[PDB]
Amino acid sequence: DPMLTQTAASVEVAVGGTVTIKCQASQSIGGYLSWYQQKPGQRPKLLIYRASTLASGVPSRFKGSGSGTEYTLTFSGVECADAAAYYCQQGYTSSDINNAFGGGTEVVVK
Template sequence: MIQSPVSVSAFIGDIVIISCLVFSLVPAESEEKPRFLIYYASNLLSDIPKRFSGSGSGTEYTHYQQHEA
């Protein structure tokens, strides 16, 4: 998860907005770099197989991967 800002100071009664980008990474094999898999909880990048999925809201998110036979 990428959070912006990383931290924030506030007083009682202040309104604080923290934005988060939630994503998952594909484990790197050999010398490949890790890459984005799912963003905003449930959106797949165009080249990611449909066996990957995700869901969630608030502070609870789940990443699913179906194993193909």
């Protein structure tokens, strides 16, 4: 069972700060990993997959890196509509796992 923990509550950040959210995995998953933003009133919404390739309609000010077992997601220039919930998620599609790919939050930006 590949497990990503994400036991990290996010720190208060101002406009223009940089945040390092770190998602670590027990088993090696390759590069297959996704990230999502969850605004607390609507459906979830994806930013980047395979830790390097961003989706359409998303600005290039979000970053992606990390390989092997640990991965990250950084960005700078925090707007007003970045108050949401974040989630890292693997794609190893195994059978005997109980993933839920959980963890991740983000404070209201001052």
